[PDB]
Amino acid sequence: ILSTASVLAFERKLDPSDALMSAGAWAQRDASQEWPAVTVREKSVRGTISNRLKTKDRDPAKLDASIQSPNLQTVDVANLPSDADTLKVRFTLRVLGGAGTPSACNDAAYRDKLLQTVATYVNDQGFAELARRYAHNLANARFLWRNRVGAEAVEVRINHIRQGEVARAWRFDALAIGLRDFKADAELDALAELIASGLSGSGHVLLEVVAFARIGDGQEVFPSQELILDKGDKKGQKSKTLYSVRDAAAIHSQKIGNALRTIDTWYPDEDGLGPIAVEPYGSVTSQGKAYRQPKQKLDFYTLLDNWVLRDEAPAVEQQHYVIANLIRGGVFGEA
């Protein structure tokens, strides 16, 4: 009857590293190899009562008493130097290949059927649309999450590191290439073919991606935020902790991977939001909602079950979504 496998673990393609933040001045970014790193430091914040009150704390005496005892805490803060207006963020990306092959599979017949399904996809249309959209999210600085919202000029440089050396160099204007449209461009097409060769398994590709953002002198930059155990004293609370590896502000690799993953424009709801990350049940953390609900028969699992088990191939857009979710990887199958 060819039921689905209980264990369907997949390994991820498109492996990014931690993205390190350094700082410097515009028009000296061609010699940015020795730019000083952005350092996460401590500052003190004093806050008032600015949250909603539950109809019992709205008493004027209680509210004023809460004012007389403000919350004192220290926060991890990352800022550019006062003589530097450009933020440099550098990471390396490795594209593996072999997306349809699971890392663990209970059923051999289901494994073979899934391999035939993915091979039929690649033979019909290869990793060309998906790689083009991944190259688009590389060209624009979407991995530069909050450091791009107010940057005046953003430039992304992507190199192909073959034997430890730049075999091919790309330079992009990350603001001309927006965060909404997946258009066509010759350099975008070349990077798309490179990522396609990586995803197909034709050759080994390693991409060094460097983004420069002209934000301003001494302006705040935004690395990834860590978890606080919340055990110390209230005055030295450490309400905000920033991610660094060796005294250098950094962005988590999975955040970079999530920003590169933002290629899903095929979800049933409208195009007002634009692309979203290719996740099962189309989850967006900021909106707190799930596009591609399982009730709407457009999530990853129902589409994969219809495509593989019972040969109901969906539309080519949903096929792109399914293959991008297999590239994304995850612990599929019933636990």
Partner: protein, 228 residues
């Protein structure tokens, strides 16, 4: 001696013994299906009751952790202020109209989740009564978290009959419901021998697989699913 079966659990002894102090001993290991839970070296002079009492505490903490892990999510009926809880209902699933909500004064009654980011909608007492009637959770709804989703589905084309081990979650005296097999057969209007044929071990020639309607009516009458 021989293996002790307590519902889904099994206390099997080691084949070869040992001597601790001057007295003979065997290692008794506790299982939950294929999951080994604990091993104890016990004297050969213990009876089955003492061996069972040695693992009763581990079984009890497993039961407590299973009740707290798979407890049904709770909906709360609040006033316009959103502070005073007027009624609490535990539901097997949430209403499909739940969205991010803070109560206003435009509506007197609001139904909200007990989860910290609260989801809700304005509700009347008639609508709240209807939702609580058609969404409530049975008192032993936590046992469904210990069972796979392909035995608890109402879709007959996606349904699989439960195995003997999955039956013993709810049918035995050492099970999570605490009813006997004869009581379970009386609930289904079935002979006790025919129902024992359902929970027969693998070392048996006469084994029967329970049907869709019988299994789901058993779950209804046991207070596990579809009982509100």
């Amino acid at each position: 001696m021989n293996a002790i079966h307590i519902g889904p659990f099994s206390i099997t002894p080691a084949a070869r013994g040992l001597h601790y102090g001057g007295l003979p001993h065997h290692q008794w290991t506790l299982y939950y299906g294929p999951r080994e839970m604990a091993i104890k070296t016990l004297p050969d002079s213990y009876t089955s009751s003492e061996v069972r009492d040695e693992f009763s505490d581990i079984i009890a903490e497993f039961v407590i952790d299973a009740r707290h892990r798979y407890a049904p999510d709770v909906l709360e009926l609040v006033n316009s202020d959103g502070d005073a809880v007027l009624a609490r209902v535990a539901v097997s699933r949430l209403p499909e109209a739940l969205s991010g909500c803070i109560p206003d004064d435009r509506f007197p009654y609001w139904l909200l989740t007990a989860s910290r980011p609260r989801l809700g909608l304005p509700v009347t007492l008639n609508e709240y009564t209807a939702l609580a009637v058609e969404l409530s959770a049975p008192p032993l709804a936590w046992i469904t978290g210990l069972l796979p989703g392909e035995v608890l589905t109402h879709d007959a084309e996606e349904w699989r009959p439960p195995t003997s081990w999955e039956l013993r979650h709810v049918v035995g005296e050492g099970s999570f419901t605490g009813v006997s097999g004869a009581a379970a057969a009386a609930l289904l209007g079935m002979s006790a021998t025919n129902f024992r044929k359902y929970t027969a071990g693998d070392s048996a020639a006469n084994r029967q697989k329970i049907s869709f309607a019988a299994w789901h009516y058993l779950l209804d009458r046991l207070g596990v699913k579809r009982a509100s």
